[PDB]
Amino acid sequence: VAPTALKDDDDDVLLDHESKTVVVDDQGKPRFTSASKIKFESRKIMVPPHRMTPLRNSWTKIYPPLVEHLKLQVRMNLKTKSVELRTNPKFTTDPGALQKGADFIKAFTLGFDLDDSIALLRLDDLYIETFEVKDVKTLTGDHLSRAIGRIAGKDGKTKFAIENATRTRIVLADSKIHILGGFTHIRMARESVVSLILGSPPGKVYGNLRTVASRLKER
Amino acid sequence: YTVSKDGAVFVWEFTKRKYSWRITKKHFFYANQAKVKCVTFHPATRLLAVGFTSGEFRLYDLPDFTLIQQLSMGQNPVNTVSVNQTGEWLAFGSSKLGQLLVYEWQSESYILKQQGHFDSTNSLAYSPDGSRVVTASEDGKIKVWDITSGFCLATFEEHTSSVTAVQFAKRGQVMFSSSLDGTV
C-alpha cells in the first residue's frame, strides 16, 4: 500500500427423422408427423486488346466488389482474353447479381472509368446507350474527324459540359459513342451530341445545356 | 490521479515490480484540438470535471473513465471549475465573457446561469416600483435584473449598436430604449 494511505456475481443469462406411422383423430381424420425440414450460372464477356492494360492495373479494384458484395465467383481467362464470371449456389443470394456484374464489366470494356462503372453495380436503373455517327449523318474523311473533334471540343471541354449538365458519362471511342446514365438522362445527352454531329457550333450547344441543367435542379 | 493539458489521465498505484509508484492505467481525452484548462476531483463520489480550452466540459467517473456527460458553454475557454462539498453541484467559470454557471448534473438542471456585460454599462433605469433594474451596455444588449435576487431574468440583443439610454413609462409595464444604430 502507499505510504500516504489513510491510517455473488449474478448471471445475466435469463429465461424469456420422420416416424413411419400415423394416428387417427376423433373425427376419423389422418394426422401425420411433420416432414423433414440461386442456380449455377455463368457469364462470359470478352475484353478487347486495348482494354487489357487498363483492366490489369485496375483489376485490384474490380474483383473486390464483385466477390464481396455480390458474392460472385470471378476469374479472367488468359487463353481467351475474357473476364470469367459465375454464380456460386452456396453463397450467392441475389438472382440479379450475376447480370449486374456482367453489365458492370461491359461498361469498363466499352471504355468507361472504373468508378463510373461501379455505378452500374450500386444502382439498378442505369443503362448504356450506344450509336454511331454514321447513323446520324453521312460524314467521311476530314468531315468525320471534325465532327468527332466538335463533340469533344478543345481539351475535351464540350464533352464535359454535356456530361455535367445531362448527368451522364460519355465515351467517344473514335466514331463510336457510348452514353451511361438514367434512361431519361441518356436521352437528354443523346440530343446534345446528335446536334454537334450535324454541324451545330459547340458554344451554341453550351447555351442549351445550361437551360436543361436549370430544369434538372428545379426538378 | 494526474492530468495534463494534452488531455491524458494517469492512474498511479503503489505496487510491487520492492514497492514503488507505477502507472497502472492510462486514459486520454481525445478532443480534436481542445486543451485541458482546469480540472477538479471529488474523491468521495469519484467525479472528474474538466474544462477544455474550446469552451466545453466533460464529466467523468473514475477509475472507469465513464463519460457521464459533455456540454459546451460557448467558444471561449473554461477558466475555472469547482465542485460542491456533497458533489451534486458543479460550477463553471470563463473569464472572456465573464460567464458563471452552476450545474446540477444529478437532475441535469441549472441552479445558476448568469453572465455579465461584455462592455461597460452605458445607462441604467429602475422599474417604477424598484423591484427590477434594466442595464444598457456599449455592446447593444439590454439585460433585465431583479433587485432582490440580483440575477439577470432576460436579455435583449435586437439593438445592433450601443444603447445610449433606457427609461420606463410611468405605469411600468413597458421599457423604451434608444441606440446609436438609429432606432428607438
Binding site: 462470359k44 470478352m46 478487347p48 486488346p49 481467351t80 | -
Partner: protein, 124 residues
C-alpha cells in the same frame, strides 16, 4: 398502348374469342444429334398432336452451340445447325445442316493494322 385515351382502331371491332389453350393439343418431342457429336441429347421441341405431326417435324432446323454438344468451352465460340430428317417414337434423328460463328467474335478478331483475307469455295 392499351390506355383508354389511345384511340379506337378498326381492327378492335372484331376479336376472336380465346377458347383453346393451344398447348393442350401440343405434344413434346425429344431431339437427338448424330453420333459424331459427344453429347447426343440436344433438347426437345413441341408440335400439335397428329389429327400428321411428322410432316411439320421433317425439315425443321435447330441451331446450337458446339460446346453443349462437345462439353468443352474450347467450342463455346462456335455454332452448328441441325435439320430434322427422321422421327421414331418421339426421338428426332437429325443430320448436319450448317456451321457459323458468333457475331461478337468476328468483330473481336477483326482489328486494325493488318490485312483481312477471305476465301470461298463451292464443292461437293
Amino acid at each position: 398502348a392499351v390506355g383508354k385515351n389511345k384511340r379506337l382502331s378498326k381492327g378492335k371491332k372484331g376479336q376472336k374469342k380465346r377458347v383453346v389453350d393451344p398447348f393442350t393439343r401440343k405434344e413434346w418431342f425429344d431431339i437427338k444429334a448424330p453420333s459424331t457429336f459427344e453429347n447426343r441429347n440436344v433438347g426437345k421441341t413441341l408440335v400439335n398432336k397428329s389429327t400428321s405431326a411428322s410432316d411439320a417435324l421433317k425439315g425443321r432446323v435447330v441451331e446450337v452451340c458446339l460446346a453443349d454438344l462437345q462439353g468443352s468451352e474450347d467450342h463455346s465460340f462456335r455454332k452448328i445447325k441441325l435439320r430434322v430428317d427422321e422421327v421414331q417414337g418421339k426421338n428426332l434423328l437429325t443430320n448436319f445442316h450448317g456451321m457459323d460463328f458468333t457475331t461478337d467474335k468476328l468483330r473481336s478478331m477483326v482489328r486494325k493494322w493488318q490485312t483481312l483475307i477471305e476465301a470461298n469455295v463451292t464443292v461437293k
